[PDB]
């Protein structure tokens, strides 16, 4: 029992973190096989930030303009190329600690672990979700650019996020490992702002099922709802629409607990109406939305505490 924000063990990613320096700028890179991946804005100087032309900035660089440091070892750069907003530096040494890995682009609502790094050295690990507005609510200080997000289901590291920048509200924007931003954001320091964010409804429902699995039912009620009536209510609280895909995804948790998905929807509607009246759910006084259905199955017992 218990329920925690649970990250993946970070060691497989720790062994891939390096420091990349260009000019006066230092940030983190990801060393897989003989390639180091990092944000292309490492090649920007002070002036360059408003309207950089990365093609023009990059053509002026030689391989030896890139300093890559793996712990105490200088790695020799022997080639470079840009893919979208990621710089790829070919180095003369394949990383002997390279895990089994793949690159995946995720959808809003998906979760992942972040290994926050500074100067190529890992500092801490935490869980994040891709918000509906394509930002993440990270914890990142100056120098964290190039830190990555990942999952490790079944001994393979799926890299899904590389950190590029902070927006004015203090949330974070970045790319997949092919260098394509999540959301409409760009690696320019022109004014940009996260949209109005919303609550990830399918994840709240998953976490309510987690609460039932762990033995608590106080928030259920005798009612049900249609999917459309649920969405009409939930959107008034700035919840994301629940789709039939989401309903299908929740099937296994519904089966394990014996609570129909639309009956859990009725419970959620009532929680939004009533609050918790001084109670908590899995240790929280608010409805939590950064655990996915898959996360709940990963962490919770397959046997409900009835």
List the x/- string, 21-60, binding to a copy of itself by CB under 8 A.
----------------------------------------
Q: In the numeric block, which tokens belong to residue 136? A: 């993440």
Among 37, 66, 112, 140, binds a copy of itself (CB under 8 A): 140
The answer to the question of residue 124 lying near a copy of itself (CB under 8 A) is: yes
* Sole residue written with tokens 């926050």: 116
Q: How far is the CB of 248 from a copy of itself (least distance, A)?
A: 26
Cα 297 to Cα 114: distance, rounded to the nearest angstrom: 20
DSSP string for 272-302: HHH--TT--BTTBSS---S--HHHHHHHS-S
Structure tokens at 89: 């530096």
Which residues inside 165-194 make contact with Na ion, applying CB under 5 A? none
User: Least separation, in Å, of the C-beta of 130 and Cl ion?
Assistant: 8
Per-residue binding letters, 90-109, with Cl ion (x by CB under 5 A): ----------------xx--
d(CA 170, CA 178): 24
Determine, following the binding rule CB under 8 A, whether residue 241 of this chain makes contact with a copy of itself. no
DSSP 180: P
Cβ atoms of residues 263 and 217 within 8 Å: no
For position 221 contacting Cl ion by CB under 5 A, the verdict is: no
**Dihedral sign (CA 199, 201, 206, 209):** positive
**Choice from 122, 143, 174, 293 touching a copy of itself (CB under 8 A):** 122
41 is catalytic: yes
Residues at the interface with a copy of itself (CB under 8 A): 1-12, 14-15, 115-116, 122-128, 137-142, 166, 170-172, 214-215, 280, 283-286, 298-299, 301
């Amino acid at each position: 029992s218990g329920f925690r924000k649970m990250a993946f063990p970070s060691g497989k990613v720790e062994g891939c973190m390096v420091q990349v320096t260009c000019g006066t700028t230092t940030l983190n890179g990801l060393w897989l096989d003989d390639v180091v991946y990092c944000p292309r804005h490492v090649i920007c100087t002070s002036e360059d930030m408003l309207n950089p032309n990365y093609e023009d900035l990059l053509i002026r660089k030689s391989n030896h303009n890139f300093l890559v440091q793996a712990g105490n070892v200088q790695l020799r750069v022997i080639g470079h190329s840009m893919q979208n907003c990621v710089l790829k530096l070919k180095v003369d040494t394949a990383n002997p600690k390279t895990p089994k890995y793949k690159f995946v682009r995720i959808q809003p609502g998906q979760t992942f672990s972040v290994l926050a790094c500074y100067n190529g050295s890992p500092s801490g690990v935490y869980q994040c979700a891709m918000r509906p507005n394509f930002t993440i609510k990270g914890s990142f200080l100056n120098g964290s650019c190039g830190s990555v997000g990942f999952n490790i289901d079944y001994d393979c590291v799926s890299f899904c996020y590389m950190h590029h920048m902070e927006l004015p509200t203090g949330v974070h924007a970045g790319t997949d490992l092919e260098g394509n931003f999540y959301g409409p954001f760009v690696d320019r320091q022109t004014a940009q702002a996260a949209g109005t964010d919303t609550t990830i409804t399918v994840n709240v429902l998953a976490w309510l099922y987690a609460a039932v699995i762990n033995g608590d039912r106080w928030f259920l009620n005798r009612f049900t709802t249609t999917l459309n009536d649920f969405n009409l209510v939930a959107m008034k609280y700035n919840y994301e629409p629940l789709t039939q895909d989401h309903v299908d995804i929740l099937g296994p948790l519904s089966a394990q607990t014996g609570i129909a998905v639309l009956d859990m929807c009725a419970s959620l509607k009532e929680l939004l109406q009533n609050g918790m009246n001084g109670r908590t759910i899995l240790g929280s006084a608010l409805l939590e939305d950064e655990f996915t259905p898959f996360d709940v199955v990963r962490q919770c017992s397959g046997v409900t505490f009835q």
